[PDB]
Curated annotation (Swiss-Prot), chains A, C:
Proteolytically cleaved by the viral protease during capsid maturation. Homododecamer. Interacts with the terminase complex composed of two small and one large terminase subunits. It comes from Escherichia phage lambda. InterPro entries: Phage_lambda_portal. This is Portal protein B. Belongs to the siphoviridae portal protein family. Forms the portal vertex of the capsid. This portal plays critical roles in head assembly, genome packaging, neck/tail attachment, and genome ejection. The portal protein multimerizes as a single ring-shaped homododecamer arranged around a central channel. Binds to the terminase subunits to form the packaging machine. It is found in: Virion. One of its GO terms (molecular function) is DNA binding.
Swiss-Prot record, chains B, E:
It is found in: Virion; Host cytoplasm. Pfam families: Phage_cap_E. It comes from Escherichia phage lambda. Keywords: Capsid protein, Host cytoplasm, Late protein, T=7 icosahedral capsid protein, Virion. One of its GO terms (cellular component) is host cell cytoplasm. This is Major capsid protein.
Length: 474, 335, 474, 49, 335, 49
């Protein structure tokens, strides 16, 4: 079985890139034919981004000498601008003109999960319906190959032109293949502009040094493919052969030496004996009507029957095989099957909350690992455009210029899915302890709750004043 | 190797034989043709007394029910090394695509394939209704003569006795011979389709030329059929009562081409004669496990790995089309 | 089975180095083909570093005579500088220009887990986008071999040039092999500069004296390889042979002496008997249609059948074999399988919290053992650069110079993953007891909580004043 | 365009059957003219000269 | 089945014919060789007057441009059932691996393959420059004689008239015959490579043995070529002006082995004679859809599923190497 | 090591070409000695006896 799937013995990058197309193609096959990939990407979406992905700008006020109040007001301005620019209802923020920021993050994270890499391009849109002429078009991974599909070279390696030190200079984007009859032409695309401008945002997780591509799926999913095939076929055979039945006719006849002599005489010159016996047996079956049930017994003149003696008859064991292996690959691939297909077998209280909190912290890990890159890159490009357009005003006491301290000025964090609910009592006792001991700040409280302290305080002011005015109890 | 559904033609233009006389298709799940199995004409007269009803009526047991269908499975290559048929200036950039070249070349290949089986089927048809005998034959295959049973009065000859060539080119009227051969045809004749020189010496008689009506006088859908297949069927006109047609179709054999029709022949019969298109088993594992063992045709596109590591288009069929009533047509060789 | 894997009887270093390439290559094979290594490295990442790795500078104020307040303010300055330098959004802190500090620690810890060693190099970047011209390029372990792949020598031993006493002087870095056709050339690299500058940070855990390389994985994982193979093959055979069926034809015939005489006469000169019998049986099977189901019975003329009598039919036992061995190697390799593939079988409350606290303390062990080295080395290099650039001001009353007391001045600790959550009630009763009895300090409280006392106090001030101003309840 | 194969397996690969002579020079004809706007042209009857 | 890139040899050791006289490779995207298409020698003298310039100069239309390249595609199995060539004690544990055994056995198989095509190409070369005729032949294939056009004075024989065997073994000098055959060679001859006994009776003359210089006196890279292929080319030494070589190469045919060279033959010509290596189409679907229709060689490793369910290494080529000037070498059969 | 196949299909399977004589007895030589520590040995010059 190791024949149809073969690992070379070498560093992972040189063991994957030669068989990149086959592994990725069979990955496409399984993610299309199989529901597990859809469920996994959907849960990753709903744990990492969830409803939305919220920007929070925190310029390094302490290091830059900027006042915290000026930083906070400038952040208010940039947050209002960014939310109003992102909430465009006409899907107009993409060059394809059919994806908002939500689906920017969606397709980016999905493709960085599947192929391990995502490709964003900051292009200059001309549609004047918005103040900001920068859109972000996502680039397929099929596009990145060496110019004219040539094999890897000295410095042109699977489509990326690098130096001897590996520094990613640029890329050869092959032309799109949709419809299925466009030819591919390779075009030069630099990774970033010299001034720090993020033109081609290439975010991938390298497992080792010098690696150019991300992680796969199929190269650990062939075994589900062939287990589902084998369980499927074995259930089919079991079902079809629980009551397969042979309906033949035998007789006494069979006078050993006499039967053999009759057969030999028929073979030599006395076939009339066989013809007469066949006629008698045909008359037998047409005067009997030899019929078993609703159907006719298949015509068998005496002396021939099937021997449907069977193989071993122990239990198939597939039960504990499949539970063990589903277990196995479930906290292999990472998301547990007791919800990837939802068993409720013997699961208990500590079971539930321990599994939930470890899995949720681990999704927080993946979120902070493979979402903040895209978030910061897009925010940096948008903030550069805003500074170009003088939408928001930089602090006058800027210790470093915007172009010099884009990292310092464009320092930001992002908020993923909403408020976690698992037990209730858990979150509420945590909340009461934090609010009584002061062990929670504005920033981490809002991180835990998916809200904002400024708005909760303003709305509590509104709550109290409306209760006082209408006669309610604050 | 492209899927089965890539078999779209909408091009059914057989020369008025398999579409007009031989509509009666019977693809089977079994190898041979079993004329006893086909109901054909049903025992169709007797009633029962007004007290109770009678016995059970069956398919009335055809005497001969065993002939070998012409299981024809040819193939070709669609190797993307050719420049193809370029319809005038529809963006040859897609021809430059191997995908579009390969798909429309499998289109071209397969259409050649069914028109090949159609032309061999038309040779079978012309043998059938010209002598009642068909030669199920081929190398590495025994020649089976499949006979519908054409009678002797259906094979009577014009050269016997007095020939139309050996007659008065001005005063003699071959209409007398027309009803003479039509009477023993088990029905009415309404098409007098000739081979070219046969119609030539037919019309050489004056009586023919001032008896025939060149006008449309559109009788039936045969004018529509001629407008469709303006290639080799030629609607000469009306002979008054009967329609005059000429077939000059040609088959292009292994090294040469020649007409389907013999030198001077005729078949007198109806346009609604009953023609059977019994079809045998299709010997393709794909066909059996998807249930196309009983069908008309089967295409496929498929790759060979190994010695002939290539990719081909394969067409499979098994027709054994015949005529239900060989006595329906009188077959005459002319002067 | 001991044939394809062979231990010599000798000290571990001389028992591993001769078979270094084969063991490491099969380790690559299993970490690429198998999901367990990916899950283990991911959990090690999320337990050791987690979200981030936080620096805290504590110069030995008491020993150096430095005031604690001056030390704390100087630490504030260096922490602001280090966070703003580390938060670079363009991935520019590496020579490869594609990894931030997070992935510095990520690749370092991953490679120090796999090969037991990690190789960092402090190089002088020329990119002027940042104030600090020092980057840190990580060096592959394949690079360290003797000059031109020569075998171990007197003092040149597997690429490291040492003295008789073993002191690691320098290294022979072979040239990179990506693309797969660059030749290797060996270049000299000293371990550290004489002035204490950390040029080539070589952090590895030696199991014994004189050992040069770290620990492996495959040399304890071959047994999972071959157990997964054997369970896979045995399930395949079990599935395919639960209903394998022989469809032959026998008959009565068989007149012993007569059949033998007929066969002998056929062998000598009377093959016409066999031809006649074969013709009769062919007519038999073509007049019967001997057909069992949807398929034709394979053609067997009488007198020959398969004897598919089986082997023993006891239960395979693989169930308790595999549970025992998964158990076994699970708290062998160290991380328990009841989460490396997530069983919830009969697991209880004391089960959960005892296992969780012991495993988490043990990850705290690994963190403090294999992360603080890299953290302190990188911090020392960065602080030396900062002192060169006069970014932060050293205390004026320095009892020892910076170059003399780099260890004393650059004394630091680091914070790994965020706030542990397992039970809730546990952490909250611990917190209330510590805050009532005063049994927790600033430093260990912030270690337990993943926060900072200064910022929690400042934000509590902000909390109270905003509640007072807006009308809320402090 | 004649041969078939036995009802067990299929035969070899059929090609373009190698024409004996495959080398002649096409008549590459490239003429030209001038369309210098100095002539009075073909005037189709009275379509607005 | 392993990828195409697993075709690394760095072993090009052809016996001084395809590497020294026949460097002039022309792989085509078209089946045959079209000598009219090859520019060959260019019309290379005429200028134009100092007023304007003349007409367009083309590839000067070779008279004969149609021969069939030797499309050779053999194969073998690399079934991991053998113990292989074990180079001395490089860890037979990897041979115990099916992966390493299979990869180095495809190495061994394919190297046998290109040395097979190389040895058949060397037989083509020896036929070519020994008679000007090459037999493009094989069973189930018509024998095409491919003639460069070797002239009669290039086929003049030593046995005609007086034989060197029928001469004084002590005083006769065959140098006179050397320039006699060299004059009508359309150039200077600088290698006198013999077959073994041919050189034997050549050197039997004393004048030869005190005229030849056994010393190195390294003239060119031919000494380097001999050091490379120390197998069957033997640098006898200097005959003074000219180099003396002997080729004793042998081909191991279906059941027996025998020398490439006939009994006593010679070709007089230059070391820089122009040799064409025209290459035909490569009939492999892989080769066409990846553009290796115009190349030298094509390997592949590939699995057959079904009846011959196995795995093979397949090598495909199509050489039709010839000599541009057959008159460049005078071919003489010796005494 | 000579024959090729026609440019339509490929030929049969080639084997190890069946050596006529394939049965001789290898010289299985297994000698031994004693290394009894009763001798003074080969003393390479003055490497610390």
């Amino acid at each position: 079985q190791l024949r149809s799937w073969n690992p070379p013995s070498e560093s992972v990058d040189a063991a994957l890139l030669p068989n990149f197309t086959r592994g990725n193609a069979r990955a496409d096959d399984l993610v299309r034919n199989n529901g597990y990939a859809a469920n996994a990407i959907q849960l990753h979406q709903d744990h990492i981004v969830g409803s939305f992905f919220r920007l929070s700008h925190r310029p390094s006020w302490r290091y830059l000498g900027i006042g915290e109040e000026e930083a906070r007001a400038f952040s208010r301005e940039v947050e209002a601008a960014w939310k109003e620019f992102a909430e465009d209802d006409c899907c107009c923020i993409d060059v394809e003109r059919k994806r908002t920021f939500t689906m920017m993050i969606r397709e980016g994270v999905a493709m960085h999960a599947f192929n391990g890499e995502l490709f964003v391009q900051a292009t200059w849109d001309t549609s004047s319906s918005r103040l900001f002429r920068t859109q972000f078009r996502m680039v397929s991974p099929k596009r990145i190959s060496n110019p004219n599909n040539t094999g890897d070279s000295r410095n042109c390696r699977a489509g990326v032109q690098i130096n001897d030190s590996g520094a990613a200079l640029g890329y050869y984007v092959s032309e799109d293949g949709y419809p299925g009859w466009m030819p591919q032409k390779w075009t030069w695309i630099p990774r970033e502009l010299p001034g720090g401008r993020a033109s081609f945002i290439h975010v991938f997780e390298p497992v080792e040094d010098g690696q150019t591509r991300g992680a796969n799926v199929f190269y650990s999913v062939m075994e589900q493919m062939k287990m589902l095939d084998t369980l499927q076929n074995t259930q089919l055979q079991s079902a079809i052969v629980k009551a397969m039945y042979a309906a033949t006719i035998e007789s006494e006849l069979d006078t050993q030496s006499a039967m053999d002599f009759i057969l030999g005489a028929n073979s030599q010159e006395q076939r009339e004996r066989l013809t007469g016996w066949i006629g008698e047996i045909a008359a037998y079956y047409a005067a009997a009507p030899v019929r078993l049930g609703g159907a006719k017994v298949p015509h068998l003149m005496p002396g021939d029957s099937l021997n449907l003696q069977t193989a071993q008859d122990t239990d198939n064991g597939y039960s504990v095989f499949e539970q063990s292996l589903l277990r196995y690959i479930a906290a292999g691939l990472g998301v547990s099957y007791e919800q990837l297909s939802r068993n409720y077998a013997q699961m208990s209280y500590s079971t539930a909350r321990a599994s939930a909190n470890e899995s949720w912290a681990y999704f927080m890990g993946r979120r902070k690992f493979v979402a903040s890159r895209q978030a910061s890159q897009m925010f940096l490009c948008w903030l550069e455009e805003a500074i170009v357009r003088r939408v928001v005003t930089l602090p006058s006491k800027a210790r470093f210029s915007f172009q010099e301290a884009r990292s310092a000025w464009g320092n930001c964090d992002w908020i993923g899915s909403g408020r976690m609910a698992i037990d209730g009592l858990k979150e509420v006792q945590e909340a009461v302890m934090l609010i009584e001991a002061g062990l929670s700040t504005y920033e981490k409280e809002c991180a835990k709750r998916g809200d904002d302290y400024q708005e909760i305080f303003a709305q509590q002011v509104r709550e109290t004043m409306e209760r006082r005015a209408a006669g309610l109890k604050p | 190797a492209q899927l089965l559904a890539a078999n779209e033609q909408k091009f059914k233009f057989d020369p008025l034989f398999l579409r007009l006389f031989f509509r009666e298709s019977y693809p089977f799940t079994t190898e041979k043709v079993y004329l006893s199995q086909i109901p054909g004409l049903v025992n169709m007269a007797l009633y029962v007394s007004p007290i109770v009803s009678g016995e059970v009526i069956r398919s009335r047991g055809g005497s001969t029910s065993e002939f070998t269908p012409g299981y024809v499975k040819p193939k070709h290559e669609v190797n993307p090394q050719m420049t193809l048929r370029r319809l005038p200036d529809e963006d040859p950039q897609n021809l430059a695509d191997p995908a579009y070249r390969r798909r429309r070349i499998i289109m071209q290949n397969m259409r050649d394939e069914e028109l090949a089986i159609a032309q061999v089927e038309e040779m079978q048809a012309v043998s059938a209704v010209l002598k009642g005998k068909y030669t199920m034959t081929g190398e590495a295959f025994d020649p089976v003569e499949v006979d519908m049973g054409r009678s002797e009065e259906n094979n009577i000859t014009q050269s016997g006795g007095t020939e139309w060539s050996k007659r008065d080119k001005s005063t003699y009227d071959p209409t007398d011979d027309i009803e003479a051969y039509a009477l023993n045809a088990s029905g009415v004749v309404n098409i007098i389709v000739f081979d070219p020189k046969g119609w030539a010496l037919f019309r050489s008689f004056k009586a023919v030329k001032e008896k025939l009506d060149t006008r449309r006088g559109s009788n039936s859908e045969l004018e529509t059929a001629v407008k469709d297949l303006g290639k080799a069927v030629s609607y000469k006109g009306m002979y008054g009562d009967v329609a005059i047609v000429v077939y000059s179709g040609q088959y292009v054999e292994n090294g040469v081409k020649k007409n389907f029709l013999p030198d001077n022949t005729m078949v007198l019969g109806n346009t609604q004669a009953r023609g059977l298109r019994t079809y045998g088993c299709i010997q393709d594992a794909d066909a059996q496990r998807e249930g196309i063992n009983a069908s008309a045709r089967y295409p496929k596109n498929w790759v060979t790995t190994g010695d002939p590591a290539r990719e081909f288009t394969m067409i499979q069929s098994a027709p054994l089309m015949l005529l239900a009533d060989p006595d329906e047509f009188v077959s005459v060789q002319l002067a």
